Amino acid sequence: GVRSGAGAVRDAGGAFGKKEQADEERYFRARAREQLAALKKHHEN
């Protein structure tokens, strides 16, 4: 019987894999910006 596994959405490299990659990158770019701002504010101290 044919089955599947974990993390097979990005393996197919279809629309959903690219969508997930773009969403993760866009979220973590904002998170990196916030962390950089906080680190700069801390380093000013």
């Binding site: 969508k19 773009a22 770019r29 904002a30």
Partner: protein, 482 residues
């Protein structure tokens, strides 16, 4: 009758002629039939010789006398072939008269060893912004133009052919690139249109078109890449730089498969012979960059592979990819989305990379490559400063990469355009008008600021003064245009 220097045809069928005799015929030796057709002894069986016929076999019949030539199959070679359209055997087919070549060279000569080669240094300008920026091709490198049917492989090849005109009619001998084009399996109409395009662009004067069309026999199509390879090797071993395009090696593989199967040799994967990998490997390995001890010449190779429905994991495409140093992936999806040439810069790679690339182009291409990589990371589907700005910059660069057909660009003009795109002079303009801005900026710079382009070309890098002047002119032109 003699049976050592001549023989008779036991059986002729489908272009394969079994010969009784030829006791002193050599492997891969060119033999000559009674009717004037020439052959090539491939199978030296104990009681017969399997000769592949270089032409139509209707003129060959049982009992015909087959005579040796005493020499392994070789092709007329030299600089007289420039501007001539020849066949696999070197015969002129453009009706311009005979070829005046004084030397001949074997089609199966061994590739240069480790010692004669040197690192790939000189760039091989193609006139394509995408290739010359993100997938640079060096001189002596072998890049595979892979893709599906009607994606632009031959367009990339011919644009590379045309771009060399500026160097060829120039003064310095170290930038001249003597192009060679090999047409395997294409119909004669396409080859005629290609040579008409080359003549229109005046690119024929330094190119050699070796055509083994579909009507030509399978042995001719199998031998065509090696003939052009020898023609390029002549330039390579004499201090001159040559460019060879195999379009396309998949049809050569098909022809070799037909030859082998008709020779009763056992089939392999996908009916191809066992040594299909060897067939291309012994060919593409002859593209080398000789050092100063051997004249300093080179032979850049541009093989073309046709993939069915983008199945890059097929037998012949995988073999050719493993053989070559880099791949230029052309994708139909990018082609229809307006990205022409459809060079998938995500997967397109160049093993030589930055080693053979002009300094200014590398300096701006690093930034362009980083920005495009980030854009591809955030392309598909809300920080205006982080994501939306990056998305817009990536869109501007993507529209920058788009280029028209049969219009190669000078390297310095490409550097100027990519500098304009990278340094945020197009984020204000609409994405649709980017091409119009690029054309107008090209005209303005090539008209008024030719001194700046000459300075960039001579220096090879954009310096502080050059950078400031380019910023000034791009700002002025942006203000004027919008």
């Amino acid at each position: 009758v003699d049976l050592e220097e001549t023989g008779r045809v036991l059986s002729i069928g489908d272009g394969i002629a079994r010969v009784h005799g030829l006791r002193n015929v050599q492997a891969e030796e060119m033999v000559e039939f009674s009717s004037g057709l020439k052959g090539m002894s491939l199978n030296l069986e104990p009681d017969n010789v399997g000769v592949v016929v270089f032409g139509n076999d209707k003129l060959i019949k049982e009992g015909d006398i087959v005579k040796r030539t005493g020499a392994i199959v070789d092709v007329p070679v030299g600089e007289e072939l420039l501007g001539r359209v020849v066949d696999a055997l070197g015969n002129a087919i453009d009706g311009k008269g005979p070829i005046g070549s004084k030397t001949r060279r074997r089609v199966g000569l061994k590739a240069p060893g480790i010692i004669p080669r040197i690192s790939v240094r000189e760039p091989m300008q193609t006139g394509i912004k995408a290739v010359d920026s993100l997938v640079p091709i060096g001189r002596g490198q072998r890049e595979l133009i892979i893709g599906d049917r009607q994606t632009g492989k031959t367009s990339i090849a011919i644009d590379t052919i045309i771009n060399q005109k500026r160097f060829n009619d120039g003064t310095d001998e170290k930038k001249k690139l003597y192009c060679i084009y090999v047409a395997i399996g294409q119909k004669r109409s396409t080859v005629a249109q290609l040579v008409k395009r080359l003549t229109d662009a005046d690119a024929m004067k330094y190119t050699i078109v070796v055509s083994a069309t579909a009507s030509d026999a399978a042995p001719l199509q199998y031998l065509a890449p090696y003939s052009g390879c020898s023609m390029g090797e002549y330039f390579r071993d004499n201090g001159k730089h040559a460019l060879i395009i195999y379009d396309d090696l998949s049809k050569q593989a098909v022809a070799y498969r037909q030859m082998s199967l008709l020779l009763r040799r056992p089939p392999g994967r996908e009916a191809y012979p066992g040594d299909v990998f060897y067939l291309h490997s012994r060919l593409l390995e002859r593209a080398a960059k000789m050092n100063d001890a051997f004249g300093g010449g080179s032979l850049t190779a541009l093989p073309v592979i046709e993939t069915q429905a983008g199945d890059v994991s097929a037998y012949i495409p995988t073999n050719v990819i493993s053989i070559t140093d880099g791949q230029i992936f052309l994708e139909t999806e990018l082609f229809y989305k307006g990205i022409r040439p459809a060079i998938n810069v995500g997967l397109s790679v160049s093993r030589v990379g930055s080693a053979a690339q002009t300094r200014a182009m590398k300096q701006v291409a690093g930034t362009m490559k980083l920005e495009l990589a980030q854009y591809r990371e955030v392309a598909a589907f809300d920080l205006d400063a982080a994501t939306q700005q990056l998305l817009s910059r990536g869109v501007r660069l993507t529209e920058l990469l788009k280029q028209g057909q049969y219009a190669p660009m000078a390297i310095e003009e490409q550097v100027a355009v990519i500098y304009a795109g990278v340094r945020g002079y197009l984020d204000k303009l609409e994405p649709s008008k980017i091409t119009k801005f690029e054309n107008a900026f090209l005209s303005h710079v090539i008209s008024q600021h030719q001194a700046l382009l000459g300075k960039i070309r001579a220096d090879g890098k954009i310096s502080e003064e050059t950078d400031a002047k380019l910023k000034e002119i791009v700002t002025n032109f942006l203000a004027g245009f919008e």
